[PDB]
Amino acid sequence: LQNIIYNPVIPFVGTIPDQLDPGTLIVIRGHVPSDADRFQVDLQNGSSVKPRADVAFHFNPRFKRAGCIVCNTLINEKWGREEITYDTPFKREKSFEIVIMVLKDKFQVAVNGKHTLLYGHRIGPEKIDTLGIYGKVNIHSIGFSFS
Ligand SMILES: OC[C@H]1O[C@@H](O[C@H]2[C@H](O)[C@@H](O)[C@@H](O)O[C@@H]2CO)[C@H](O)[C@@H](O)[C@H]1O
């Protein structure tokens, strides 16, 4: 892996040091605290807060009740149509590895070595230059594999 970041402070907002071309991997290892309600990994067009940076891919594990993962896109401060995955591999008090693979028409995400979901591009992946991680999560490392 390339351009590795260790033990970042959350919230983390960092520049992605190269293009997200097809085959590019974003690898995030961490653990979920016992009191987690939710956390999110956001692939963003910049880091503006006013107006809020568009979020090409919002990947949002939620932990209340049975749990789920919500995915969405934010364009001009409006959320689009949510895509919900009910078969969530995340658990409070457990470590994880998220691998996001960028493909031509979509993202593919695997967690703990098992395929989890797909998310079709709504914003051109060329516009993504920023990785945001927010919420109740502890991140051990972030790494990239650029194609
Ligand atoms: O879609 C991603 C965003 O969801 C927002 O919450 C939604 C909620 O998921 C939905 O069920 C409904 O109640 O509308 C809410 C407001 O749009 C979160 O606030 C936001 O952080 C994103 O996760």
Swiss-Prot record:
Highest taxon, organism lineage: Eukaryota
Annotated consequence of substituting residue 62 to H: Abolishes localization to cytoplasmic vesicles in case of infection by S.typhimurium
Residues the record lists as binding a carbohydrate: 62, 72, 82
Tissue specificity statement from the Swiss-Prot or TrEMBL entry: Ubiquitous. Selective expression by prostate carcinomas versus normal prostate and benign prostatic hypertrophy.
UniProt site (Critical for binding to sialylated and sulfated oligosaccharides): 52
Every Galectin domain range: 12-145
Cellular location(s): Cytoplasmic vesicle; Cytoplasm, Cytosol
Oligomeric and partner information: Homodimer. Interacts with CALCOCO2/NDP52. Interacts with PDPN; the interaction is glycosylation-dependent; may participate in connection of the lymphatic endothelium to the surrounding extracellular matrix.
Domain notes: Contains two homologous but distinct carbohydrate-binding domains.
Function: Beta-galactoside-binding lectin that acts as a sensor of membrane damage caused by infection and restricts the proliferation of infecting pathogens by targeting them for autophagy. Detects membrane rupture by binding beta-galactoside ligands located on the lumenal side of the endosome membrane; these ligands becoming exposed to the cytoplasm following rupture. Restricts infection by initiating autophagy via interaction with CALCOCO2/NDP52. Required to restrict infection of bacterial invasion such as S.typhimurium. Also required to restrict infection of Picornaviridae viruses.
Protein name: Galectin-8
Species, as recorded: Homo sapiens (Human)
Part of the intact protein present: 8 to 154 of 317
